[PDB]
From a paper:
Here, we report that PmSLP binds host complement factor I (FI) and facilitates cleavage of complement components C3b and C4b independently of any cofactors (e.g., FH, C4BP), thereby allowing the pathogen to evade host defence. We show that PmSLP-1 not only exhibits a high-affinity interaction with bovine complement factor I, but it also serves as a co-factor for factor I to promote cleavage of complement C3b and C4b. This protein-protein interaction thus plays a crucial role in modulating the complement activation on the bacterial cell surface and increasing bacterial resistance to complement-mediated killing.
To obtain more insight into the interaction between PmSLP-1 and FI, we performed single-particle cryo-electron microscopy (cryo-EM) on the purified complex. We then performed symmetry expansion on the particles from each of the dimeric complex and local refinement to improve the resolution of each protomer, which resulted in a final EM map exhibiting an overall resolution of 3.5 Å. Analysis of the PmSLP-1:FI structure shows that PmSLP-1 forms contacts with the light chain of FI, with 1374 Å2 of interface area calculated from PISA analysis. Specifically, hydrophobic residues W417, L418, and Y499 of bovine FI interact with a hydrophobic patch on PmSLP-1, formed by A116, A120, I128, L129, and I175. A second hydrophobic cluster consists of F422 on FI making contacts with I142, I153, F165, and W205 of PmSLP-1. And finally, V214 of PmSLP-1 interacts with W411 and V426 of FI. In addition, this protein-protein interaction is supported by two salt bridges and a network of H-bonds at the interface. Notably, the residues on bovine FI that form salt bridges with PmSLP-1 are conserved only in sheep and goat (consistent with the pulldown results), which further support the host specificity of this interaction. When compared to the unbound crystal structure of PmSLP-1, we noted a loss of the short helix in the handle domain of PmSLP-1 in the bound state but no major conformational changes. Although PmSLP-1 and FH do not share structural homology, they both bind to the same region on FI.
Residue numbers in the entry:
A (entry chain B): 103 to 318
B (entry chain A): 48 to 311, 322 to 349, 362 to 600
Write the structure that this text describes.
């Protein structure tokens, strides 16, 4: 159930006297819960344990740092939305243009969050858009939808090397690095219909969440 | 003793760009000012003529042609409309080397004398080199003025010009100081070696005129190796003696610029000195070294970190473009695809949005690097370039200036050492840490038989509380000049009993390796002040 005042995450504190490869304990793991305010929410501008952007009371998205091998640190990108705020309306003839953000990380740098701009456009159930980096205008990803599922989107990369990544990728719509996108239509608390779009996707090379919002 | 005996062995000259700024028409390469190509001049200037009768677009073009062909001396400014020559003559002199100084201007047909009041050994040197005496002048004299002549010229020369036409001439009146005299330097008249200083070119001058701030040598060799300045001369931090009038006059005369900090007649000929200063303002200016216990963001935008796997093996220094400076032993070619570059971050476990990561494309390790003595422990890291980007840019990183001479900083200068090194009791440090250290004049006592002064540099704290530990290798040893510009003086090479007093950290003297880096990265990317 949605609770922006208590959201699950992990607080990872490093081992103060951790030796260099002498022991496998280098950080300590505990369960923590946070209350989110409007806008981006984080603790330390130098060592953030969590980034979360509260677009509206009905939805938030972000990531929390997590580990599985107790020796390497990875980012777990997640999103949540109010169940009653999700819109189940028909959209086969729905037209709009959407703006938002796309956070992701790569396999070689799992702990480094990477920002990207996302542009979305719906015309009569047909979806198209483009993804750009923060500081430069390179085409990173392509939004192309399914004719019988506006709620579902396939995403494929268009560059050999993602920002903050050393892993080589395959380009083209036939690339094996595609992944599916589940889009949730969110109505804002003020009564605007389908005000925000959220969704998360993951490959073994990269994983992230899509944070999207209605412009017109 | 105002003269530094140690520096004199280096026989620095006016062309030594490690000790004096090059002229606008030269370039500093392998520690020597090399003359630019006439093409290389800035296109803004005034047309001039040489004694050979050819016109040149700018004064610096003529100076470069001078630097290749000595016989092509500057004659007059403007177009070569008139054919009037520029000659100097000596009269009323027992020996052809001596006599009253008389100058015939290019635009004036009457030979007439020069005033004695504004007459110095610099103008005498210029006059003698103009007459053909390569070794310049010997002394100066003021004789009585001709009662039949009431007009004379006051002349001002920088001291490096090849002819008086490059000097400035002003209208003057015969005053009580009379007219100027000169005796050109000759081997027979050279002073005894006992009480004489030896110029690089062989000229002998009295010891009292060495390191006096006055350019008494032909090539300035008497004013580049000094412990203190005699009389009114101003002493640079780098041991250069400069006259007082060059202080607070608007151009950098000392290498570190301390001469310009804390600063609040009818023209017979054009001011070629004003042209030279004006030309200096058009050389490209490099923007580096300026910024917009644990540290914070932006305190070290030049701080680079190389990661091997999940551990930061060593630190690094950003230099510009896709180039990073790091100790040679910190990297190996065989692990080419494993290194990662991390920037603009404080915690490696918790990087922020501002943190970006780049791959390594090429690594250059110095050829003469020795793995046993740690000599020449420098490596250059070439960051992987974005294929669709014409130029490698890091939006959130500011490169730090690389020193071009080993004389930028002196012993006991305050410098900053930083890195991710080990804490006390070998505790793991997960945040960028920075400390202050002081440079040491001597270090051979602490490390006899292993310390090399030309290549290795020793610094540390008196109490030893703050010191670079293991893992600080590749870390910066940065210093700030009088202008608050950050220079990367050294990179962490090795340390014995890190954190203990009397065992200072040892850092490779990066300034000694400016030529190697510049030849590997492109000189114009990292060079300032035509160097
Ligand atoms: C690295 O430096 C060491 C120390 O000088 C060199 O080893 C000695 O080099 C001298 C040079 O004349 C020889 O006379 C000795 O016989 C060497 N001794 C040993 C044990 O090697 C070493 O050669 C240098 N190596 C490189 C690659 O520069
Ligand atoms: C040099 O002259 C050109 C010609 O118009 C002018 O555009 C430029 O500003 C000048 N540069 C300097 C440094 O005077
Ligand atoms: C520097 O150390 C060496 C070590 O042998 C010594 O010979 C020399 O005199 C020292 N110079 C000083 C202290 O100025
Ligand atoms: C840095 O700037 C401050 C500004 O007043 C100045 O006081 C200080 O001396 C400068 N640092 C150096 C090393 O000159």
């Amino acid at each position: 159930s949605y609770n922006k005042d208590a959201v699950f995450t992990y607080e990872l504190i490093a081992n103060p006297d951790a030796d260099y490869s002498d022991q496998k304990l280098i950080l300590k793991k505990e369960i923590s819960y946070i209350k989110l305010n409007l806008g981006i929410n984080q603790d330390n501008k130098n060592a953030p344990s969590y980034i979360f952007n509260l677009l509206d009371d009905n939805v938030y998205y972000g990531f929390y740092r997590d580990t599985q091998d107790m020796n390497r640190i990875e980012n777990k990108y997640t999103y949540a939305f109010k169940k009653e705020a999700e819109n189940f309306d028909n959209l086969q003839k729905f037209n709009a243009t959407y703006e938002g953000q796309f956070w992701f990380s790569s396999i070689d740098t799992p702990n480094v969050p990477t920002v990207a701009r996302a542009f979305l456009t719906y015309n009569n159930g047909r979806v198209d858009g483009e993804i750009l980096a923060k500081h430069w205008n390179e085409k990173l990803f392509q939004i192309t939808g399914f004719d019988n599922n506006p709620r579902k989107v396939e995403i494929f990369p268009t560059v050999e090397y993602l920002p903050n990544s050393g892993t080589r990728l395959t380009k083209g719509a036939t690339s094996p690095h595609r992944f599916q996108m589940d889009l949730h239509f969110i109505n804002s608390t003020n009564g605007e219909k389908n005000k925000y779009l959220v969704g998360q996707g993951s490959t073994e090379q990269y994983w992230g969440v899509l944070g999207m919002e209605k412009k017109q | 003793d105002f003269v530094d005996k140690k520096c004199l062995t280096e026989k620095h000259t006016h062309l030594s760009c490690n000790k004096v700024f090059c002229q606008p028409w030269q370039k500093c390469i392998d520690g020597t000012c090399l003359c630019k190509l006439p093409y290389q001049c800035p296109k803004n200037g005034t047309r001039v003529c040489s004694t050979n009768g050819k016109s040149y677009s700018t004064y610096c073009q003529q100076k470069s042609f001078e630097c290749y062909r000595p016989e092509a001396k500057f004659l007059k400014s403007g177009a070569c409309t008139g054919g009037g020559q520029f000659s100097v003559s000596l009269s009323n002199g027992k020996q052809d080397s001596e006599g009253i100084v008389a100058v015939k201007l290019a635009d004036l047909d009457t030979k007439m004398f020069v005033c004695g009041d504004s007459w110095s050994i610099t103008e005498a040197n210029v006059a003698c080199i103009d007459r053909g005496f390569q070794l310049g002048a010997l002394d100066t004299h003021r004789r009585d003025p001709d009662p039949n002549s009431a007009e004379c010229l006051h002349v001002r020369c920088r001291g490096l010009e090849t002819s008086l036409a490059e000097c400035t001439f002003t209208k003057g009146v015969h005053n009580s100081e009379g007219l100027a005299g000169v005796v050109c330097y000759t081997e027979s008249a050279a002073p005894p070696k006992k009480d004489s200083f030896q110029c690089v070119n062989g000229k002998r001058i009295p010891q009292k005129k060495a390191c006096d701030g006055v350019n008494d040598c032909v090539d300035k060799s008497d004013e580049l190796c000094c412990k203190d300045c005699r009389g009114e001369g101003f002493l640079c931090k780098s041991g250069v003696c400069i006259p007082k009038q060059y202080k607070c006059n608007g151009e950098l005369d000392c290498i570190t610029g301390e001469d310009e900090v804390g600063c609040e007649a009818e023209m017979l000929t054009a001011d070629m000195d004003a042209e030279r200063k004006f030309t200096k303002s058009f050389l490209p200016k490099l923007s580096c070294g300026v910024k917009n216990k644990p540290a914070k963001m932006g305190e070290f935008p030049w701080q680079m970190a190389i990661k091997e796997g999940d551990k930061i093996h060593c630190g690094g220094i950003y230099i510009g473009g896709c180039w990073i400076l790091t100790a040679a032993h910190c990297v190996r070619i065989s692990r080419m695809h494993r290194y990662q570059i991390w920037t603009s971050f404080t915690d490696w476990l918790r990087p922020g949005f501002q943190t970006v990561v780049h791959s390594v494309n090429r690594i250059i390790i110095h050829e003469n690097y020795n793995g046993t003595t740690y000599q020449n422990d420098i490596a250059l890291i070439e960051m992987k370039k974005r294929p669709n980007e014409k130029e490698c840019v890091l939006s959130k990183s500011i490169p730090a200036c690389v020193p071009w001479s080993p004389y930028l900083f002196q012993p006991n200068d305050k410098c900053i050492v930083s890195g991710w090194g080990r804490e006390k009791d070998n505790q793991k440090v997960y945040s960028l840490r920075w400390g202050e250290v002081h440079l040491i004049n001597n270090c051979s006592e602490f490390y006899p038989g292993r310390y090399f002064e030309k290549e290795m540099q020793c610094a540390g704290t008196d109490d030893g509380s703050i010191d670079a530990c293991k893992g600080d290798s590749g870390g910066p040893l940065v210093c700030q000049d009088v202008n608050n510009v950050t220079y990367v003086w050294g990179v962490v090479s090795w340390g014995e009993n890190c954190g203990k007093s009397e065992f200072p950290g040892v850092y490779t003297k990066v300034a000694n390796y400016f030529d190697w880096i510049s030849q590997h990265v492109g000189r114009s990317l990292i060079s300032q002040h035509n160097i």
